Amino acid sequence: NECKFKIFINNSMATLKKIESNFIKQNNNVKIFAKLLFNIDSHNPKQFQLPNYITQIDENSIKYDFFDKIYKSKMVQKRKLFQF
Amino acid sequence: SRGQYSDENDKIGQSDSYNPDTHIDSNSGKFLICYKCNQTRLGSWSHPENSRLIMTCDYCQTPWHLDCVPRASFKNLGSKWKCPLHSPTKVYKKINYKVWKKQRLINKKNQLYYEPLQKIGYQNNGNIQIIPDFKITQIDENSIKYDFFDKIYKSKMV
Amino acid sequence: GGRCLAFHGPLMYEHYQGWKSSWDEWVGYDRIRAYNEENIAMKKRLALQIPIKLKSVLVDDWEYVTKDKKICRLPADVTVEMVLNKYEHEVSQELESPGSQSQLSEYCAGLKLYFDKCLGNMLLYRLERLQYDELLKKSSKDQKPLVPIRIYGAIHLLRLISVLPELISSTTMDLQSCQLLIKQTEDFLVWLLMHVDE
Numbered sequence A: 001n002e003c004k005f006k007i008f009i010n011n012s013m014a015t016l017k018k019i020e021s022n023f024i025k026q027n028n029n030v031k032i033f034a035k036l037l038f039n040i041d042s043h044n045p046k047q048f049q050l051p052n053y054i055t056q057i058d059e060n061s062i063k064y065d066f067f068d069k070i071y072k073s074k075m076v077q078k079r080k081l082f083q084f
Numbered sequence B: 001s002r003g004q005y006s007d008e009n010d011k012i013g014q015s016d017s018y019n020p021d022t023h024i025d026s027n028s029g030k031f032l033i034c035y036k037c038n039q040t041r042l043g044s045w046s047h048p049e050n051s052r053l054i055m056t057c058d059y060c061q062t063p064w065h066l067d068c069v070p071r072a073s074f075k076n077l078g079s080k081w082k083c084p085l086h087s088p089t090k091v092y093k094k095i096n097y098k099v100w101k102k103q104r105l106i107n108k109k110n111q112l113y114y115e116p117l118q119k120i121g122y123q124n125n126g127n128i129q130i131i132p133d134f135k136i137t138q139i140d141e142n143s144i145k146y147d148f149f150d151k152i153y154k155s156k157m158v
Numbered sequence C: 001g002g003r004c005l006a007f008h009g010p011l012m013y014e015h016y017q018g019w020k021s022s023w024d025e026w027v028g029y030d031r032i033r034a035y036n037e038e039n040i041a042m043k044k045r046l047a048l049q050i051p052i053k054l055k056s057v058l059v060d061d062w063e064y065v066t067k068d069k070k071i072c073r074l075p076a077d078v079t080v081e082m083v084l085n086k087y088e089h090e091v092s093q094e095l096e097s098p099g100s101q102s103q104l105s106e107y108c109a110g111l112k113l114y115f116d117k118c119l120g121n122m123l124l125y126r127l128e129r130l131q132y133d134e135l136l137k138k139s140s141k142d143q144k145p146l147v148p149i150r151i152y153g154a155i156h157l158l159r160l161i162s163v164l165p166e167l168i169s170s171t172t173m174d175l176q177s178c179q180l181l182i183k184q185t186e187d188f189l190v191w192l193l194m195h196v197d198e
Helices: A002-010 A059-083 B142-156 C034-046 C056-064 C083-088 C103-115 C126-138 C155-161 C175-194
Strands: none
Touching: A059 B142, A059 C155, B142 C103, C034 C056, C056 C155, C155 C175
């Protein structure tokens, strides 16, 4: 994957331009980790070790998700007034 | 002229009587509708007293009547007329207090840095722009309403 | 509004800017910006660690993967779907602060797209590697995508979420993201402290 990565981007194309600057518009439910998904081919796999110390449809998707979140918020408010 | 601070807050029969040209914009020729009352209230030449003075904003060109907001007459000398709709330069919260004198913006060059990473609990303390070091982040409506609903739900019982 | 908004190559549109009036066209076709076609082809080609609370299970499983690998059945009955949907019904309404369940649900969706992609790089043993290749070979007879949800157990959850923090530090982001990350793994260990049967 390392050979593909360079031959694809690291050689002569979009060295200064950020590739992962426009993947937000097509990817949903990706908020916490975003930068580490781009360079998944830049590191070679290795064996297991352990240290000795150890946007149209996306708007609709987030709108229905937030509707479900609001209904759940109402439900936990009912639960907390029941338990209080 | 003499070497004083001049930001974008500072600006660079007529004197009374009827002024219908203030109600007419040269950009499109349409009618300047005020925010509070959905009227321009041009009135008539037979009833000059029905006419109300209006002014446009120096930033967003928002029409406003002289009766809605507390204001007597126009603002011709001094700082630019800032309608009470934008971000205030000085805020006050008693806890001694935080003033938060904004950031007064910076250049388009490499000093401006963008880093859209997190939308909930980002702790950006303001200074954001809306899209469809001074670390600023890309902020949309979903993030804003989401952090508001989290905040006033966690702050109701206090 | 704005300063750059044009269906064609941008020319500081707030009509072809910088040209005469006898060039306008308002035909309806496909619209692609492409950053002025890569700036007219470059001007015509130039002219942190987890807390020590339940540290024993990972040390026990470190020796267990030498010859037994913690799993012997390829169609394992233990999956992740119901134990994953459990947190949206038990601890999202009890343990976290009252409000929105974004910090759990969006992270769980992220864990779906991380678990569906992370196979091949990292959390692999040698015998686990040949098991993965044999699963891929036996799943390629019907040209269907390989779903790692129904053929993988939930006992690897703690090891992937404990090898996650040292690969957060590979790239550069803000520190409160790492604060929230270690907080959600701490909440996960807080839940899994009691339920040791899973």
